[PDB]
Amino acid sequence: GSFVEMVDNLRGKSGQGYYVEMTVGSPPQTLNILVDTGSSNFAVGAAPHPFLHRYYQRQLSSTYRDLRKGVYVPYTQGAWAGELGTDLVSIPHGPNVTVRANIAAITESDKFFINGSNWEGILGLAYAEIARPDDSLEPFFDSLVKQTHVPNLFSLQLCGAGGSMIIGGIDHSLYTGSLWYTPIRREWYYEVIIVRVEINGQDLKMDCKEYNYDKSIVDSGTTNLRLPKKVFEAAVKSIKAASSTEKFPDGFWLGEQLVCWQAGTTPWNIFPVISLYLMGEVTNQSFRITILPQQYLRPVEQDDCYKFAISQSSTGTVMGAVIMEGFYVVFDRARKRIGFAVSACHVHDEFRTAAVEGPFVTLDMEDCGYN
Numbered sequence: 001g002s003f004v005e006m007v008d009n010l011r012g013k014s015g016q017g018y019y020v021e022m023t024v025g026s027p028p029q030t031l032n033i034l035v036d037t038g039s040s041n042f043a044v045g046a047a048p049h050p051f052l053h054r055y056y057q058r059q060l061s062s063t064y065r066d067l068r069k070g071v072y073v074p075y076t077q078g079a080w081a082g083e084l085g086t087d088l089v090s091i092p093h094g095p096n097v098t099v100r101a102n103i104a105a106i107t108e109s110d111k112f113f114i115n116g117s118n119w120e121g122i123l124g125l126a127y128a129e130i131a132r133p134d135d136s137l138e139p140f141f142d143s144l145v146k147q148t149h150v151p152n153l154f155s156l157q158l159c160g161a162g163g164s165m166i167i168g169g170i171d172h173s174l175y176t177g178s179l180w181y182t183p184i185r186r187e188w189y190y191e192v193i194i195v196r197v198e199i200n201g202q203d204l205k206m207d208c209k210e211y212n213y214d215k216s217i218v219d220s221g222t223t224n225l226r227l228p229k230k231v232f233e234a235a236v237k238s239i240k241a242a243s244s245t246e247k248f249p250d251g252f253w254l255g256e257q258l259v260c261w262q263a264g265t266t267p268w269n270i271f272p273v274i275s276l277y278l279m280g281e282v283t284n285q286s287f288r289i290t291i292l293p294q295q296y297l298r299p300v301e302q303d304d305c306y307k308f309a310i311s312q313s314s315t316g317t318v319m320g321a322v323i324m325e326g327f328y329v330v331f332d333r334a335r336k337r338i339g340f341a342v343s344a345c346h347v348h349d350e351f352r353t354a355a356v357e358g359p360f361v362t363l364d365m366e367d368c369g370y371n
């Protein structure tokens with residue numbers, strides 16, 4: 001395909017975050033940057049840190065421009081403090097352009113960087129509304145689109161146990177079947193609306209407003225499929241019931257205890273598939289994405305240990321890596337929609353595969369959103 005050079009430009013397959021190489025400053029300073037659709041700030045470690053192998057050295061960049069303003073960004077897991085500036089930025093295995101972007105030099109941090117993760121910064125791909133200090137600090141992708149010809153669209157193929165980030169388009173070799181789109185409800189986080197949830201085909205039977213209580217987002221920076229407390233509780237009960245041929249401790253379901261199997265003997269078959277129906281592009285029409293235990297049971301560095309990766313949240317549903325690793329996801333910003341298609345690299349077995357199917361009839365989907 002025409003976008004071949006961007007294929008396989010991500011790393012972090014069996015790791016702690018998917019990252020892409022980004023070259024900043026002049027002379028060139030390339031760093032590993034976490035791909036995060038759950039935030040909107042581009043920031044890079046700029047001082048030595050125990051978990052960082054390399055960092056941004058502003059004094060060595062002749063093109064660096066100090067903005068003379070501090071910036072602080074808290075996340076679900078950790079936070080960092082830094083200094084704002086702008087510099088030249090290019091993505092070697094991404095678009096063939098170079099833009100001057102806002103860059104936050106991370107000088108201090110608390111539980112942000114992850115030991116052994118190999119990434120030294122973060123690329124917040126969400127919208128300006130949630131950028132810090134405020135929405136006036138233009139995010140990287142916004143700069144890319146405004147300064148260049150690059151189409152306002154990117155797509156992610158996260159390959160778990162690194163993947164491809166196609167910028168400006170789509171590569172058809174990354175998925176099979178059809179692409180199904182759900183509207184981006186509002187441009188801040190990549191917010192979507194979930195209208196129905198099934199465990200092995202069985203409806204969880206909860207008011208859809210509960211599935212999006214507060215909000216539902218697609219976030220490549222979050223490991224798990226996080227669900228509102230009420231939904232999490234009902235989901236776990238149903239999953240346990242469907243996998244009753246085997247019993248596991250309560251801690252396993254809370255992500256506190258790991259369960260290991262002899263190398264290559266994990267009974268994937270005893271666990272149910274999980275389906276999330278998303279609002280479609282046509283009135284009263286929806287489609288569903290289905291993941292396998294290979295997606296929600298994550299390996300932990302002759303024993304194969306796994307952690308149940310569906311957890312609870314008090315800030316809404318978060319469709320993280322657990323969801324994204326089963327699909328090729330198209331962030332069509334230009335048409336305010338997110339597309340899903342079965343990923344050509346998703347992990348499965350000879351009996352089941354992840355799926356994206358439709359259409360389905362779902363009424364009153366507009367009422368599912370939180371106001």
Ligand SMILES: C[C@@H](NC(=O)c1cc(OCC(=O)NCCCCCN)cc(OS(=O)(=O)Cc2ccccc2)c1)c1ccc(F)cc1
Nearest residue numbers: 015016017075076077078111112220221222223224311321
């Ligand atoms: C990068 C990594 N992300 C995480 O481990 C990560 C990020 C989160 O919130 C967003 C956030 O903090 N974004 C800010 C950027 C990340 C900062 C991390 N301190 C929440 C989160 O919590 S969780 O519900 O998934 C349970 C959990 C906790 C710790 C480790 C694994 C799983 C885990 C990640 C690992 C694997 C992936 F496939 C994708 C992402």
